Swiss-Prot record:
Domain of life per record: Bacteria
Encoding gene (name): csdE
Stated family: Belongs to the SufE family.
SUPFAM superfamilies attached to this UniProt entry: SufE/NifU
Known role: Stimulates the cysteine desulfurase activity of CsdA. Contains a cysteine residue (Cys-61) that acts to accept sulfur liberated via the desulfurase activity of CsdA. May be able to transfer sulfur to TcdA/CsdL. Seems to support the function of TcdA in the generation of cyclic threonylcarbamoyladenosine at position 37 (ct(6)A37) in tRNAs that read codons beginning with adenine. Does not appear to participate in Fe/S biogenesis.
InterPro entries tied to this protein: Cysteine_desulfurase_CsdE, Fe-S_metab-assoc_dom
Pfam families found in the cross-reference section: SufE
Entry protein name: Sulfur acceptor protein CsdE
Length: 149
């Protein structure tokens, strides 16, 4: 009789698309967003190797990128990863938030870039860099394709 629990990340819990909007609400300057974003990572826990194995490797961004998830019984997937670049690290948050217990379908029904764009944590990011966010997202599309099938 027991139940293990790990990865006490916010994303939704305390870091909801809203909360982020409340933080950026005042921060109208991208400089801030990009700035605070860095701190967003600090908040995130240090992704251990054990989890690294549970997640997938992503070397198509500013720097190393680790991400992993799993479809629940109903489908409620839970994302969890990290990155080297604080900035990127923070970005994940928003993402993990956009995918707040979302279903594969849902994801396809609404890209996680919405939040990023909404908050402007990407809409501003140069096209080039944007290519990255896409890749990340694609990770889902690829997954959703599996869950869908």
């Amino acid at each position: 009789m027991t139940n293990p629990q790990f990865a006490g990340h916010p994303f939704g819990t305390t870091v909801t698309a809203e909360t982020l909007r409340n933080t950026f609400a005042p921060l109208t300057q991208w400089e801030d967003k990009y700035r605070q974003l860095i701190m967003l990572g600090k908040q995130l826990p240090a992704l251990p190797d054990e989890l690294k194995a549970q997640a997938k490797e992503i070397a198509g961004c500013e720097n190393r990128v680790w991400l992993g998830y799993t479809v629940a019984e109903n489908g409620k997937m839970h994302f969890f990863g990290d990155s080297e670049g604080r900035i990127v690290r923070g970005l994940l948050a928003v993402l993990l938030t956009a995918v707040e217990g979302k279903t594969a379908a849902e994801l396809q029904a609404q890209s996680p870039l919405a939040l990023f764009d909404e908050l402007g944590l990407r809409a501003q990011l140069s096209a080039s860099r944007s290519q990255g966010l896409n890749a990340l997202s694609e990770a889902i599309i690829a997954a959703t394709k599996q869950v869908l099938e």
